[PDB]
Symmetry: C4
């Protein structure tokens, strides 16, 4: 087969339909379902799969005790069939670590896992299920990457890494891989002041990443990557429709080249589709906690610092827990355009539900529709008392 080429634009987004949901925590109440977090979705040319970071234990297993912990030697990036739960028996390990990305280039899949102690972490780059390249920490402060799929164009797969402080200036690098080999890496340029956990998608013939400013910003940093020239720019979403969490209330003027202030030293992984008038932003409903999720149609959110919603859709009720969210597309589907998709992580357990001693999640996933479809709300569905 061939390297996939980003030759298509996004489909028109008039609503979102249900694409995938695994009900992991519901099922894992009485099945050998693996504790996970930081999930995402990524497609091969013949199959789409769920991904997450395992915690090396099942939910009912006693080792689930204390899995709010982010980084341990018992974590690993796993994938499993679409809308199935991540079980001990059906899960395929891609690589070992506690921060990851993964993407198919049309021929084979590249997966990257970061492992190690905070001051000595390292990334291993896997291609065609074999280890190919390794990158050592350059700032010795929790080397970390996207926690969602990367995008490939003609065999070139850009990945965004960050090494350094989570509450101040850090050292962010965009790496360009082909077949697992390092072609080139760049220091972060542009006006974005802090970069974490970029959510990327590809469209003719560029790659757009919506990331997390954990330092001072409640608006989201945007990195736009050219995968042919292997260059990039950065700024923020200009829109006053702020999409981080926690975050202040929406002003009437956003910020294009600086963080919008109000909430320091925190954030959540999130995403957006920036496509002129076809722009949709995702965010939690709450401005304080990781609860609820909605999609908002905000024309020219990227460049218009006055832009407001003209349409929207509720994905998760504010009364229900959410969490991380990120973008993905099936680049091998039929049609003239790429259908925009995303997932929402539904975190259950700690810190918000400390009656149990574990932290896991399930996945809900949506794709766009050119129809104006009715909306439902998609909660995790598990009842905590059952786990007591």
């Amino acid at each position: 087969r061939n390297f996939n080429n980003l030759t298509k634009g996004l489909c028109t987004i008039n609503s979102w339909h249900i694409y995938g949901k695994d009900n992991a925590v519901r099922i894992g109440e009485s099945s050998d379902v693996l504790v996970t977090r930081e999930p995402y979705v990524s497609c091969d040319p013949d199959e789409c799969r769920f991904y997450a970071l395992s915690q090396g234990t099942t939910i009912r297993g006693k080792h689930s005790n204390g899995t709010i912990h982010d980084r341990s030697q018992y974590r690993a990036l796993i994938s499993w069939p679409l809308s199935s739960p991540p079980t001990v028996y059906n899960s395929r390990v891609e690589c070992i670590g506690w921060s990851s990305t993964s993407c198919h280039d049309g021929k084979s899949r590249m997966s990257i896992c970061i492992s190690g102690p905070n001051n000595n972490a390292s990334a291993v780059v896997w291609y065609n299920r074999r280890p190919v390249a390794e990158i050592n920490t350059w700032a010795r402060n929790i080397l970390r990457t996207q926690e969602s799929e990367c995008v490939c164009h003609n065999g070139v797969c850009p990945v965004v890494f960050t090494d350094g402080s989570a509450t101040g200036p850090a050292d962010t690098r965009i790496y360009y891989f082909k077949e697992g080999k390092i072609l080139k890496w760049e220091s972060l340029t542009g006006t974005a002041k802090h970069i974490e956990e970029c959510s990327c998608y590809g469209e003719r013939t560029g790659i757009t990443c919506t990331c997390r400013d954990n330092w001072q910003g409640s608006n989201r940093p945007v990195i736009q990557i050219d995968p042919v020239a292997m260059t990039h720019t950065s700024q923020y979403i200009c829109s006053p429709v702020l999409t981080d969490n926690p975050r202040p209330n929406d002003p009437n003027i956003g910020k294009c080249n600086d963080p919008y202030p109000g909430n320091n030293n925190n954030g959540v992984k999130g995403f957006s589709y920036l496509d002129g008038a076809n722009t949709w932003l995702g965010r939690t409903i709450s401005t304080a906690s990781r609860s609820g999720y909605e999609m908002l149609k905000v024309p020219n959110a990227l460049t218009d610092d006055r832009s407001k919603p003209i349409q929207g859709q509720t994905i998760v009720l504010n009364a229900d827990w959410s969490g991380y969210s990120g973008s993905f597309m099936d680049y091998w589907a039929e049609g003239d355009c790429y259908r925009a998709c995303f997932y929402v992580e539904l975190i259950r357990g700690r810190p918000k539900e400390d009656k149990v001693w574990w932290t896991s999640n399930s996945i809900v996933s949506m794709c766009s529709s050119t129809e104006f479809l009715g909306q439902w709300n998609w909660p995790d569905g598990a009842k905590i008392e059952y786990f007591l």
Copy 2:
């Protein structure tokens, strides 16, 4: 490969032999078997599989509590290997929803799931395991479809949908799909007064659907579809051998173009094979509850309003619970004719067995034989007290 063409007639039906049985509830007493309901069977050119709507939990799982509920965000259409139980680990999710159909066209499989709230439901059409088309509710009252396989001819797959009241006139549409794309849709024509949960099979070169009249009828509505012209007619089974449930006792004159009265606002999904003198009707043995199942040979049941049984076979004893039933065939088997098959849903738990708080089912499945084979009876086999 090629699109399957309905070039064959039905085989002669002189009896029914055992084809499949999963013993799900028996096995699920001490295994991670998924709670399901509304099951069916559908074949690929190289494999036949069980299908059902999952409830997003195992039987022993505490979340099975309250699964008599029909529609929730935790349901999904799953398939699994023939005569295996639907387990957490061996089940493949086809799409997310609480009403479905699915069928192979010879090249790839089309699956359709409906999800959403009662006044805003929507169908997503999957083809080759990718979402292709979406249909929004047109009557805003539980958009719903067949709950058994559809039939394809030369790439054209007709599906029967209903939107609107379950106790009065509703808005029924026949959709014609090819490769997941909507070719055409039609409003329901003919003399059938209410349409739900059609059970279809294909024979040279038309498609016959036996459905459920939930309004006033205890005789079954029949839709006959021409998949080339993409047109249809409707009426009832003329036979006084009434095959819904609940239902009145068999009269000596049936009704061809109107519901036979006696039982309002209720029914069960059922099926028939209408083939002149090769006609076999299926039904529950009880006229009051979903218990028992039998096949009755009723010559010209479709057109003869005096027709009576001349042969029969017991499938499930009246002392045993049954439920939904529907038709399917292996259109890729060897031979000159299509062998008629069906399944019976064996519902266990609520409402009829309320010592437990769940509702699930297992599957028994039969196909026709040109031999006159001895009959057995096929109960679910699970003992409720074990679940207490």
Copy 3:
């Protein structure tokens, strides 16, 4: 690919080496392992698999209570990977019933299951995982067949069936199938007075079946089938080395054309390889119960009514339970000769161990070696008290 042709003779048998063992009961103490009985082994051209009749429940499942029962609607012929246990999740159902056979012809597999009540049982013949032919009971008294693999030559697969009394004259038929279709069937001819559960193997270019006389005989009936002419003969193993169970002590003169007396109305499925001086007989060590198993080299056992052992090998200690045993070969292995193989069923639970209320089994399997290898003993290995 092509139909397999029996073009080779048996390899020289100088000992037996371990080939397969699943430890099902050991593992099933704390895993979802299916209760089974009547197991065997059968090879495809690219894989060899374990087979058995499931009881439709796991060992720990409460439904295992009463599985000493031979025939129920919850039984089915399952296969699973070599030396794995028969679990809920890894088992593939071949067909539904409580008596079976199965064999590959080089192109596809034919499986046959008998189901039904005692006076109305019927066999369904599956080929390439599709139902092809059906045979109704001709004597209305537990229609039953081999409970081990059949053998195919040039697409022709002979099967031995018996219908009628287990304690008197019965109606035995040899059926000849090709691609699941009935080519011909014959009434049992020769001097064998009672036929049950034949164990067959194929060698240039005939098929040899060693069966069970449940009526009066403690010597074993032998059917020799010509798969080209589609004809057969029958007699007993002439050897005074009696190989049924229960059985009298070995005399000095056996019987060639009549049952050797002493034990009526009982027996066990067993096997032999009859190959001139390369002859090996299998049997239980005990003459009273299904315990122990040994192979005995008895030159010309088939024709010499004075023949005695000149070599042997213990397979299972007399202190350990055994059960059914049968023959199989990999007809697609490399080499000039067919390597003789067999399995022993290790029955655990009732009737011999009635502290538990279930009956299951595990499998040990051996093949011949041209070396003179050391012997071990192969017990089931499960400790009953753990199940209490």
Copy 4:
């Protein structure tokens, strides 16, 4: 496809990165994970897999009681997907026995299992998942082999066997197989005085085995095999950096042709990569017990009896249990050189943790990097109290 040829040298080893870890004991606390020991890793041309000797029971299963036992009829060589746990459902049995090796030759896999009583054990050689050759015990004292992968060159796969005393002179043989057939076998030559459990790797165009001296030596025996000529030599690692366990403290002069004294009648399976200045030795950190693991860069360890470490990396903390370790490489990866890999067995339970009555293990696995990557430590991660 073709026979793999050892045409490449080792890559430069500047550090080790994480390659695989299964967390079996953590996961097996609440999942059907098989009790194992003596694990290793071996690659096919399209997949790499974990291997181990099963104990025929799960960890939570009551039959895990007493699995410190080395040799029983319930053991078997199993393989399962990389970094998954060895579960009942995902494990593939390769052959039956309590001592093993296995390796792909580029076309198919050869697996060897030894079973039997101590004075009558025998090896069965499997090729392409079929039994091909058998070797009887020649010294009648626990016939035993490598417990890690073998290496093939042009279809020739050398295996090191030992039969005889574990505390004195034994009879060691190097067997040369092709497609499972015995080409030739040799008695052990050279200056190595005792040989057990060789860990081998292949490099242009020879095979290097690092073994265990269980008699008098705490330095490791090295066998170097020529797979074309089918000949070999033996000696010890000259280095004073002693790498057995238990072992004395490191002297300043090692031994090239005799055992370094201090610890009798004990040892552990271990490995090394001997490549001039690219030499790395593995060993436990403790000199007394199987705890901890480290890699040490020791230039010319094989020939220089004064050589000392100039670089190193901790793999497992001394406070954590280790166990067996062995070498493997992906001989089908891309590149100009072979990347050196190894695994460490992390033994949990008895004898060191006798609060539980079982003995199992999990696996950590590493490969080399030409980068100088930061190090972590990789413990098993299971907490014993959970199992009480």
